[PDB]
Amino acid sequence: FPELKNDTFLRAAWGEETDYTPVWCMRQAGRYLPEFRETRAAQDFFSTCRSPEACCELTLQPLRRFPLDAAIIFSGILVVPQALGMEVTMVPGKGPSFPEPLREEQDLERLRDPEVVASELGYVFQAITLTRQRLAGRVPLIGFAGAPWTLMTYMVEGGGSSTMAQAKRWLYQRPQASHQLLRILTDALVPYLVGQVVAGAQALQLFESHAGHLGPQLFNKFALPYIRDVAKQVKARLREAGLAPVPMIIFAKDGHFALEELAQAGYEVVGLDWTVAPKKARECVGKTVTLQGNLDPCALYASEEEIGQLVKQMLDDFGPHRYIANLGHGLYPDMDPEHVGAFVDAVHKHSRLLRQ
Amino acid sequence: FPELKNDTFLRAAWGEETDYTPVWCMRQAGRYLPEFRETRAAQDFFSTCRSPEACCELTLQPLRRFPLDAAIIFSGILVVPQALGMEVTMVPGKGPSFPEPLREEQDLERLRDPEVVASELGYVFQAITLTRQRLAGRVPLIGFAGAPWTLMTYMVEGGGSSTMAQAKRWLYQRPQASHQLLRILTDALVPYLVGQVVAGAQALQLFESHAGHLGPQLFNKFALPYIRDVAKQVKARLREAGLAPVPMIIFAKDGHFALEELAQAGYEVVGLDWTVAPKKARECVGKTVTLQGNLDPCALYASEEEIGQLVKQMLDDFGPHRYIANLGHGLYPDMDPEHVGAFVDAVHKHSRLLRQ
Numbered sequence: 001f002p003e004l005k006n007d008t009f010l011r012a013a014w015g016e017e018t019d020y021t022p023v024w025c026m027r028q029a030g031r032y033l034p035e036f037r038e039t040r041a042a043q044d045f046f047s048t049c050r051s052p053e054a055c056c057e058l059t060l061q062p063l064r065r066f067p068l069d070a071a072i073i074f075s076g077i078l079v080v081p082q083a084l085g086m087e088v089t090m091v092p093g094k095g096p097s098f099p100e101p102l103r104e105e106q107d108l109e110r111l112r113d114p115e116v117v118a119s120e121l122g123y124v125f126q127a128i129t130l131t132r133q134r135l136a137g138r139v140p141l142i143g144f145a146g147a148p149w150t151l152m153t154y155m156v157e158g159g160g161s162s163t164m165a166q167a168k169r170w171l172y173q174r175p176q177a178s179h180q181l182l183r184i185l186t187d188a189l190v191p192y193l194v195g196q197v198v199a200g201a202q203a204l205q206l207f208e209s210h211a212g213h214l215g216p217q218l219f220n221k222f223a224l225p226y227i228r229d230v231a232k233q234v235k236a237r238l239r240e241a242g243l244a245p246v247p248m249i250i251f252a253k254d255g256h257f258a259l260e261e262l263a264q265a266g267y268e269v270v271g272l273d274w275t276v277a278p279k280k281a282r283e284c285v286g287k288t289v290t291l292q293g294n295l296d297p298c299a300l301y302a303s304e305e306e307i308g309q310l311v312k313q314m315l316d317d318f319g320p321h322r323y324i325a326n327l328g329h330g331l332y333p334d335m336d337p338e339h340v341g342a343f344v345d346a347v348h349k350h351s352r353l354l355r356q
Numbered sequence: 357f358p359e360l361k362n363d364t365f366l367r368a369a370w371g372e373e374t375d376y377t378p379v380w381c382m383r384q385a386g387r388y389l390p391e392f393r394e395t396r397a398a399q400d401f402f403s404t405c406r407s408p409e410a411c412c413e414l415t416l417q418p419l420r421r422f423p424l425d426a427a428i429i430f431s432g433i434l435v436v437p438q439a440l441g442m443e444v445t446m447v448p449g450k451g452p453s454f455p456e457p458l459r460e461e462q463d464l465e466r467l468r469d470p471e472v473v474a475s476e477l478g479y480v481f482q483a484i485t486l487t488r489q490r491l492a493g494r495v496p497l498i499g500f501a502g503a504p505w506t507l508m509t510y511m512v513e514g515g516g517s518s519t520m521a522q523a524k525r526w527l528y529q530r531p532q533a534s535h536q537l538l539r540i541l542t543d544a545l546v547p548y549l550v551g552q553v554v555a556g557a558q559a560l561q562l563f564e565s566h567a568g569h570l571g572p573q574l575f576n577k578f579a580l581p582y583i584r585d586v587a588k589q590v591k592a593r594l595r596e597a598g599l600a601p602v603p604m605i606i607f608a609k610d611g612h613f614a615l616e617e618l619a620q621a622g623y624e625v626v627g628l629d630w631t632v633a634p635k636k637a638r639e640c641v642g643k644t645v646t647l648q649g650n651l652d653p654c655a656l657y658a659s660e661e662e663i664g665q666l667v668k669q670m671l672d673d674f675g676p677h678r679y680i681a682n683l684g685h686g687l688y689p690d691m692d693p694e695h696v697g698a699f700v701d702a703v704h705k706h707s708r709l710l711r712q
């Protein structure tokens with residue numbers, strides 16, 4: 001692959017000092033860009049995900065507008081449940097759905113052997129290799145997947161939920177079947193994530209988007225072991241294949257209660273939502289791991305000047321070391337691309353001022 | 357499409373006698389027009405190129421001022437490298453750039469299959485069809501592209517260069533990879549150029565703008581074969597599609613040394629820069645092909661009276677037959693529209709005096 005030119009994001013992820021603070025935005029390829037809407041209008045979402053050229057194009061679009069310090073491959077988190085044998089539908093103005101969710105233990109019988117899932121996800125690897133080539137070393141390419149618990153929630157609930165009452169009812173009433181499903185997902189995620197790196201991914205982020213519905217006790221029992229296993233096994237397989245392990249990011253949204261554990265879970269970077277004050281986060285995680293985040297995405301509705309001030313304050317709190325700037329969640333569809341650019345520029349400007 | 361009303365330019369291109377000498381100007385749609393600046397201020401350059409209505413408007417603007425005998429579609433030469441998978445940026449007051457140029461053989465792997473490029477350039481075809489309809493037969497519409505070597509230079513150098521030292525270093529040190537890249541470009545250019553004619557282009561000009569950096573030996577080895585192949589294949593495909601081939605113009609700027617070869621390269625018209633005396637050019641190319649050119653663009657800084665005299669002398673040198681008037685390169689941004697009109701009127705006036 002082409003040699004990396006701007007590696008600031010990788011150096012930061014590993015905890016090295018850098019000349020400025022690298023920045024990227026979750027959902028940087030998203031509907032807030034008119035050009036994203038134009039490209040997506042041709043196919044449906046899961047069909048777009050299966051076109052390497054379409055994925056590459058959507059990945060590159062934000063970088064043409066903004067000097068972001070990383071690209072993230074365009075794909076879905078639900079590709080993994082899909083590859084395990086569940087049928088997803090994408091609903092107009094309402095979202096993804098599994099019309100036949102898992103609701104009893106016997107339903108696990110209809111899933112694929114997790115060892116074959118990577119083969120079913122060849123299209124993601126194709127998208128990654130293409131994008132890595134087309135980026136031509138400008139910035140690093142991040143691969144991603146959903147964490148085991150979060151994927152379990154979509155598979156059991158059949159979509160999003162305000163309570164995760166059905167998936168939590170599995171944890172309490174069906175602990176064994178829950179651990180079985182969580183192990184299947186882990187065993188599918190490991191080869192998938194390793195394949196992303198084989199294909200050219202230079203960093204990996206695991207999205208535990210539904211962490212917050214668990215308290216500490218359930219998170220430690222049912223989410224954390226599998227978070228840990230994913231990191232440990234992905235690094236093991238990469239080293240055994242003669243490849244370099246990549247920095248791994250764990251993002252547990254609404255996971256304030258788990259930060260101290262997450263810092264010891266074998267991820268280089270711990271991503272933060274906007275509800276955790278940066279200084280408190282730093283106390284929780286300690287002085288090795290890198291923090292990523294965490295501006296309220298809604299702060300981008302403020303004026304460009306206001307965004308600059310909020311960014312300044314955020315960077316003062318995090319300090320210069322062991323930090324990668326981002327939002328505390330993904331960009332929303334009604335956001336102004338010029339305010340995303342304001343965000344990116346302010347991180348670069350103030351992080352330099354903070355050093356010299 | 358609407359029937360052509362004024363076909364003087366086409367008759368001249370094919371070497372027929374005409375009542376007067378047709379004229380057009382390279383960059384006639386350009387920044388020297390205040391109205392061009394006004395229209396371009398809304399989008400960036402490559403974005404303007406992707407709007408058929410914007411391209412049509414910019415194409416028509418010069419014809420509203422001057423009775424030019426041809427229109428040339430508003431587009432870029434770098435659209436082809438872009439469609440092959442390279443990222444271009446357009447720099448304020450400095451120009452186009454590929455921040456990730458091709459520098460080793462392995463970099464060729466990140467290009468598209470040349471057979472898919474025409475599909476990526478549908479927006480140019482849309483612009484051409486719209487403009488052809490809107491022109492309503494007033495004058496012929498010229499399509500264009502960059503020649504293989506010239507496109508290679510931008511892809512390897514990453515922009516303009518005073519020496520082409522990097523691209524020439526490919527020719528000398530990487531002849532095979534050079535021929536590979538030049539073949540990719542040829543194979544992309546052929547379907548693109550044919551698509552321009554399908555879309556309504558009535559003539560085609562290939563710009564070998566960087567010919568002069570090569571001597572005769574390298575030009576014959578690396579530029580000429582692909583110039584020749586483009587003409588031969590474009591004409592073949594058009595005839596096989598049941599369409600009429602169009603006159604093709606080869607313009608090798610600073611290509612004095614190659615004129616005799618260019619006259620046998622399968623182009624109806626050989627464009628000339630202002631450094632070649634018209635009578636010497638005619639000796640080089642012989643008596644079949646039509647010559648196009650060649651007034652020093654800077655001559656338009658002279659008074660309207662002086663421009664008339666320089667035009668008279670130029671037309672005396674070329675003689676009435678097998679000639680299309682133009683500048684020896686494109687109009688510069690600080691030029692006076694009234695002096696472009698003086699140029700056009702003087703060609704029409706003196707060419708008529710030269711016949712009767």
Ligand SMILES: Cc1c2[nH]c(c1CCC(=O)O)Cc1[nH]c(c(CCC(=O)O)c1C)Cc1[nH]c(c(CCC(=O)O)c1C)Cc1[nH]c(c(C)c1CCC(=O)O)C2
Pocket residue numbers: 026027028029030031032045072073074075076077095096144160207208209253330332333
């Ligand atoms: C509608 C929807 C999709 N996918 C999803 C939804 C529902 C989200 C919700 O709860 O509101 C589910 C999803 N998508 C993503 C996540 C993880 C993020 C998180 O929740 O922490 C989850 C759980 C990130 C993503 N989503 C996407 C990526 C790929 C990277 C990128 O696009 O930048 C990631 C990591 C791409 C995607 N995927 C989808 C869209 C519309 C997009 C474009 C971005 C946007 O406008 O939202 C379909």
Ligand SMILES: Cc1c2[nH]c(c1CCC(=O)O)Cc1[nH]c(c(CCC(=O)O)c1C)Cc1[nH]c(c(CCC(=O)O)c1C)Cc1[nH]c(c(C)c1CCC(=O)O)C2
Pocket residue numbers: 382383384385386387388401428429430431432433451452500516563564565609686688689
């Ligand atoms: C700045 C720039 C552009 N494009 C380019 C540059 C750098 C040129 C340089 O070396 O100084 C590159 C370019 N543009 C064109 C050529 C081929 C001409 C040649 O060099 O022989 C090349 C190599 C012709 C053209 N350039 C354009 C066309 C379309 C036809 C037309 O505009 O009349 C052609 C054939 C349009 C164009 N394209 C661009 C502008 C500003 C314009 C308007 C014309 C102007 O004021 O220069 C962007």
